[PDB]
Amino acid sequence: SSVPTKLEVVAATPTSLLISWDAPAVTVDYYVITYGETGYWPYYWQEFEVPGSKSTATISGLKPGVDYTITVYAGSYDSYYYYGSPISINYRT
Amino acid sequence: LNCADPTSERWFHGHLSGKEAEKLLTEKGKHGSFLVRESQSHPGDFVLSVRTGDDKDGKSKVTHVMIRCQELKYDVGGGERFDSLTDLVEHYKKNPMVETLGTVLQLKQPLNKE
Numbered sequence: 244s245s246v247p248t249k250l251e252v253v254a255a256t257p258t259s260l261l262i263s264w265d266a267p268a269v270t271v272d273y274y275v276i277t278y279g280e281t282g283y284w285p286y287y288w289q290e291f292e293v294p295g296s297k298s299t300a301t302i303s304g305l306k307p308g309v310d311y312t313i314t315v316y317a318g319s320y321d322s323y324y325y326y327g328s329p330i331s332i333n334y335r336t
Numbered sequence: 337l338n339c340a341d342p343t344s345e346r347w348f349h350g351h352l353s354g355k356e357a358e359k360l361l362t363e364k365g366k367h368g369s370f371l372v373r374e375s376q377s378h379p380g381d382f383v384l385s386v387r388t389g390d391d392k393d394g395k396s397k398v399t400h401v402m403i404r405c406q407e408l409k410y411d412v413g414g415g416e417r418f419d420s421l422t423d424l425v426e427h428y429k430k431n432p433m434v435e436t437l438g439t440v441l442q443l444k445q446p447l448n449k450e
Contacts, residue, residue, distance in 0.1 A: 275354065275376075283436045286402045286413030292355045304392065306438060316377060323351050325376050 245330040246317045247274065247298070252334045257307035260334060264315055266298040271317040275325065276300050281310040281333060310335045339405035342372065342382070342421040347446035349373045354385070354400065360447055361387040362396040368444025372403070372421065381405075382421070384412070388439040399437060 247264040254261040262276070272295045279288035293300055295317075305311065313332050316325040342348055349357070352373035361369050365387045375381040382403040389397030401412050403424075409417040410424050412433060418424040425443060433441035 280436050283413075283434060286404075287434055287436045287441070288400050289398070289437055290354050290400060292353075304438065318376075323353075323374075323376060324379055329377070 245328045246271070246326050247315055247330055250313070250315050250330045250332050252313075252332070253299075255334065255336065257336055258305050259301060259303040260305065260311070260313070261299070261301055262313065262315075263299045264330065271295045271326070272320045273318045274298075274300075275316040275318060276302065276313070277316065278302050278311055278313045281312045284312040285314075307336050337380075339408055339410055340420040345372070345422060346448040347371050347425070348421075349449050354398070357385045358395055358398045361385065361398055362394075365396065365447050366445060368442060369447045370425070370443050370445075371447045371449075375402070378402075386433075386441060386443065388437075388441065397439075399439060399441060401433065401441070 249265040251263055252260050253263045274293045275290055277288045277290040311334055314329050316329045318325045349371050357371060357373055367387060369387045371385050373383050375383050384401040384403055386399050387396055388399040404411050404413060410421055411417045416427060428443045
C-alpha cells in the first residue's frame, strides 16, 4: 500500500525523464519528487514539490547512460512529515 | 538522540521543508552555502542542504545530503565519521563530499537561522 501508486517513466530523453503516478481516488495536498544517481542514492538527491492536483513531472538536466533512482512522496499541509510508504523506481539514461 | 545534539548550531534550522530551504539558499545564499534541517521522510534524522547552482524559475539549485547517526558518530553515508556535525561541516569545507548530479559537492558559507 504505497502512496502514491504506479510510478513509471512515461518518456525519456538522454537528459530528461517524463514520469507519472496514479491520480488517485483519495487526494493529497502535494507531492515531492526526489531523484539521484543510484549508488550515491539515498544519501545524495535533488527534489522538487508539485501540487496534489498533478500526477506528472519532468526531471531534467540528467546525464546519458546513468542509473537513476526516483522516489515520489505524498504530503499533507497539516503535517511537516511526508506520508509513509512512498513509491520508488529505477531508470537508466 | 543517539549522537551529539547539533540543535543549538546557528546553521541548524529544525523544521524547514526542501522548498523553504531552496528559497532561503536562493534569496540569501551563495554557491556552496549550506544549512541543516530535519528530514520529512525520516523523523529525527537530519538533512544537509547545499546550494550547487545559480539557476534551476528564478530559484537556485540545491543538492540534499542524508546525515546518518550510527554508534555515536555522524557521517554522510560513508567515508569519514565525526563525533559532531560541527566537525563534519568543517571537514567538508576543506574536503569535497562527492561528485554527483553534475556538480562537485563541497561546503562554503553556512546559511544561519534568523
